[PDB]
Amino acid sequence: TKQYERKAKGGNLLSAFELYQRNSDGEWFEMCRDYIQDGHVDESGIFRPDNAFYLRRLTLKDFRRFSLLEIKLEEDLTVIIGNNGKGKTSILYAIAKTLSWFVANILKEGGSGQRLSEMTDIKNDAEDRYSDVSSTFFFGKGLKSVPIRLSRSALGTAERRDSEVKPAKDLADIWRVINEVNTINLPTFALYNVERSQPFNRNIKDNTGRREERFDAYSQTLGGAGRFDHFVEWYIYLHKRTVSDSRVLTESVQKSIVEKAICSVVPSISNIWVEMITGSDLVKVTNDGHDVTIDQLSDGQRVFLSLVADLARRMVMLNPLLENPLEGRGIVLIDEIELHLHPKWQQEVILNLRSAFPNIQFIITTHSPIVLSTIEKRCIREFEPNDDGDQSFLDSP
Amino acid sequence: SWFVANILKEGGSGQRLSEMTDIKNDAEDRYSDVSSTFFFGKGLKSVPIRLSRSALGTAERRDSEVKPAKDLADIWRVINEVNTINLPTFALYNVERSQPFNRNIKDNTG
Amino acid sequence: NIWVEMITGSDLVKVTNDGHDVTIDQLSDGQRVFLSLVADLARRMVMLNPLLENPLEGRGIVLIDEIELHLHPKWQQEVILNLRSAFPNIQFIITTHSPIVLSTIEKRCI
Amino acid sequence: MSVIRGLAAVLRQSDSDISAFLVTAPRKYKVYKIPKRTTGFRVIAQPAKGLKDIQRAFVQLYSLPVHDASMAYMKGKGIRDNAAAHAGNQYLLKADLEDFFNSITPAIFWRCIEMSSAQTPQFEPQDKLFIEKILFWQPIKRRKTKLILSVGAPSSPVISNFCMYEFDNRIHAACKKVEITYTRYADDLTFSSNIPDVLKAVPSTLEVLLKDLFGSALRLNHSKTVFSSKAHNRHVTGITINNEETLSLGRDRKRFIKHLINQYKYGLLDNEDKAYLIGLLAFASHIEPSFITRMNEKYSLELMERLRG
RNA sequence: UAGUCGGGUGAUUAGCCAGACUCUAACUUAUUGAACGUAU
Ligand SMILES: Nc1ncnc2c1ncn2[C@@H]1O[C@H](COP(=O)(O)OP(=O)(O)OP(=O)(O)O)[C@@H](O)[C@H]1O
Ligand SMILES: [Mg+2]
């Protein structure tokens, strides 16, 4: 026993929670809660937490077209460049499956994550017929490393490889158990790919779940396209209450925060509201100085609005104790950032997002040169024109 | 439903409770249970079962308990494949039984 | 190259793509979409003109929106000439917002 | 000549009782759990009393070759010798192996004893039955064909050094031609040099040589390769190297030792922490002996000789 | 710029004072067994 006390008094996180559970079965509870909550306001008026959370390194062995590969990532922004057939989508697919083991263990004790397919993800001519993926995360000077591995063997072979997932369960239990006694702010995870472009209709609703309770924010968050049909239903619920005229916020404040972010980021929308005088409920916007319903917008306009609106709702529900909810921790993945955008909008998208969301880590890809024209040179990674699965490390220009 | 599934095939699974309809709206325990007990003569006088569920985001979890029910259904299935026996019946008739009759019985299958 | 093959008592399609052999579900999105346009248009003309020495020399009208979708800069520079070389007698109406595509077309057509 | 007479003579017992006991020498083990320093358990198995005596006796009758670059489980040497050899070089590399003990089986041993570059001893063909029943563990009761080498048994260290003999022999001779230094502990590999862009090639060379000697049986753990230089932290088997090219206990451990002496000055310390403090000072004297000369200056020699055992 | 090494005060695992260094590039670990340092 004395060994845990000599570690805990030195500032180690995992030894403090071990004493709390063993002795509860109040000195050790406050050490756990303060490590998660401490921070200060900088000279520009932005809140910054004492302990950050992010990904440091990735590695791949006999996976799709790669024999062996390594890559190192930046704490703020990273951008990948190339042509058709070079592996850009296949990298984001490997990261997204790894994050699913955290989300499953915040919702339920002893939950289950996603798998690799034994039919299509193994390399076609590899002699040993199995594949592996490996990662490493950071969470401040209380614990400087957290490792994970996923693996699988080809269809019809006689010997099976195993995964190693326990270190992810150990961290996710601290966030789940401390939050039930007292309250804390929680992290965000999301993926957007090319399945975002789709048509819109009004005759639709879900009879599963409730759209006003805190844990709905994690529902279908790694699926590839956001549930914009849940945003409309939630925004109408806020209206019907506020019309009847600690640190939690009232529906009147929550409604005001979201409307300001939408008008600030999208170049050509200037106001939005709900109305219901005719017998039914509708959403209206002002666009080029004219007045329209959402179904009259062009595809380039609807796609950009749909992305910005869904992220803001999740940020506001998960951080109930901050003064400005858009400043919490998290990780976000986006593929093909210029889909449907005119060349005058393409050259300025990235810097608006980094202004509106100051503490998130972004990972992004593209195949056009105009988007880079304002970025610094330590944020960029690029493939060889000469490669055929030989390049074993990705590098800057 | 747990007896019927185990007579037909090895392993198998029954039905389960629903998290958004069946749990009482304001109970501070945040979980719900249903419990039963059967009899099968002087040599096997008690067989208990429990079904359970709980709300999402809690510190702990509740599971079901069903092993004593699987054990009895395996005896009926294993003995019958060696030498034939009689088997039990289970049924439910609801208010939905009153509906019209379709005279075109053209459908055929083997 | 492209051909039909049989494995495990089932038929399936193979292609050779930049040096290696694959199934259709392994291609990138910029490769699939471009294949899907050309394969559909060729069938319909082969079925409709049975009495020409080359079925693809018949007549008609075709509409296309957003030619630049999923293509990188070196391909979107040249796609128009390859289509017009393969279907000599069709009338085309086309739309775009990228000025690279225009860099090989005469001023009357715009 | 034969092992059974040799054991019976050295143990001073009748030889029929040796052959009667050895029939089921596998399965004579006890199993238990020990805690990790952060959270969780490690699982250990140890051979039953009396089977220990046969193992200690066997390693008297025979001897096997060992290369100079090995640093563990050998007499006279220790971890300070391993740390001292790299202390002059400004660049560093490290690597590791999967499942080092459990990966060894009788088929590996009987190949290595035969194909050797060195003077292995001869044996009677019929003694192989008794040799296998002395050296290996059967973990699963029904799968009677599984035999593996346990970490908890007195004979295992020697056998684990012998199996590496040709790997150490070749890689050291290769590094000497290019100005690179090599040493190996139980299962750590360490490389260093004083010129740039030479260390980048090495990981590829190891992976070829491993499959050439062992085939599928042992492999490199890809998740643990690390590079460092004079611009970042450097350590070897728990010992730190400073920018003045000398060995160190590190600032954080020095400051923690100062606190415990200050508790003793005012009589606040108690018997458990007093015993622990004496054990640390006995260790610290071997690695950084100039530290004690400063401690009996900041505190009186009078107080220091009272604390000392 | 920011990281990393550590001589000195300091009821001392904190804070503060002084002086140094850069190959894309450290993350402190396990007994009752084996080897080593110190008692007995
Ligand atoms: N199992 C496999 N074995 C070998 N090659 C494969 C395998 N699976 C896919 N490929 C190769 O993967 C490449 C496409 O990879 P991916 O779709 O990730 O690249 P991408 O072009 O950058 O994607 P995108 O631009 O749409 O984001 C193709 O060249 C294809 O031949
Ligand atoms: Mg000991």
Can you spell out the DSSP letters for D93-121? EEE-BSSTTTT--HHHHHHHHHH-SS-PP
In this structure, how many other beta carbons lie within 10 angstroms of the beta carbon of residue D112? 20
Asked whether the beta carbons of residue B61 and residue A110 sit closer than 8 angstroms, the reply is yes
**Strand E lies under 7 A from the Cβ of residue D152:** yes
Find, among A354, C38, D109, the residue nearest to C46 by Cα: C38
Pairing mode of beta strands A188-192, A330-335 = parallel
Q: Could you give the count of Cα atoms lying within 13 Å of A307 in the half-sphere of its Cβ? A: 25
Find, among A55, A16, A47, A58, the residue nearest to A33 by Cα: A16
Note the helical H segments in A9-71. 13-24, 27-37
Residue at token pair 């400005």: A324
What is the distance between the alpha carbons of residues A11 and A365, in angstroms, rounded to a whole number?
A: 39
D110's tokens: 């009987």
Please measure the distance between the N-terminal and C-terminal CA atoms of chain D and give it in whole angstroms.
Answer: 52
Pairing mode of beta strands C61-65, C91-95 = parallel
Note the helical H segments in C1-110. 29-48, 73-76, 79-86
Find, among D128, D153, D149, D119, the residue nearest to D4 by Cα: D128
Q: Is there a contact between D124 and D1 (Cβ–Cβ < 8 Å)?
A: yes
Helix axes of D271-287 and D290-298: crossing angle, nearest 10 degrees: 130
Spell out the long-range contacts of C86-94 with Cβ–Cβ below 8 A and sequence spacing 24 or more. C86/C56, C87/C41, C87/C56, C88/C56, C88/C57, C89/C57, C89/C58, C89/C59, C90/C59, C90/C60, C90/C61, C90/C62, C91/C60, C91/C61, C91/C62, C92/C62, C92/C64, C93/C61, C93/C62, C93/C63, C93/C64, C94/C64, C94/C67
H helix and E strand count, chain C: 3, 5
Nucleic strand E contacts from chain D, 17-36, CB < 7 Å: 32, 34, 36
Q: Is there a contact between A192 and A309 (Cβ–Cβ < 8 Å)?
A: no
Residues 181-240 of A with CB under 8 A from C: 194
Concatenate the DSSP letters of all residues of D128-171 into one string. Answer: HHHHHHHH-B--SSS-TT--B--TTSTTHHHHHHHTTHHHHHHH
A27's tokens: 């000195």
Q: Is there a contact between D14 and D106 (Cβ–Cβ < 8 Å)?
A: no
What is the distance between the alpha carbons of residues D55 and D131, in angstroms, rounded to a whole number?
A: 10
Q: Is there a contact between D174 and D168 (Cβ–Cβ < 8 Å)?
A: no
Beta bridge partners of C21: C16
> Which chains touch C (3+ CB pairs under 8 A)?
A
Q: What was the experiment behind these coordinates?
A: cryo-EM
Closest partner residue to C72 among A194, A343, A367, by Cβ?
A367
Find, among A251, A272, A264, the residue nearest to A351 by Cα: A264
Q: Which residue is closest to E13 in terms of CA–C1' distance?
A: D256
Resolution in A: 3.0
Helix axes of D202-214 and D165-176: crossing angle, nearest 10 degrees: 150
Beta bridge partners of A69: A60
What is the distance between the alpha carbons of residues D144 and D106, in angstroms, rounded to a whole number?
A: 14
What is the distance between the alpha carbons of residues D52 and D153, in angstroms, rounded to a whole number?
A: 8
Q: Is B15 helix (H, G, I), strand (E, B) or coil?
A: coil
- Ligand number with the minimum distance to the CA of A94: 1
What is the distance between the alpha carbons of residues D141 and A232, in angstroms, rounded to a whole number?
A: 63
Q: H or E stretch including A365? A: strand A361-366
Tell me which amino acid residue A31 is: M
Beta bridge partners of A111: none
Closest alpha carbon within chain A to B19: A209
Find all residues with CB under 8 Å of B16, minimum gap 6, and list them: B51, B53, B64
Q: Is C100 helix (H, G, I), strand (E, B) or coil?
A: coil
Closest partner residue to A177 among B20, B59, B61, by Cβ?
B59
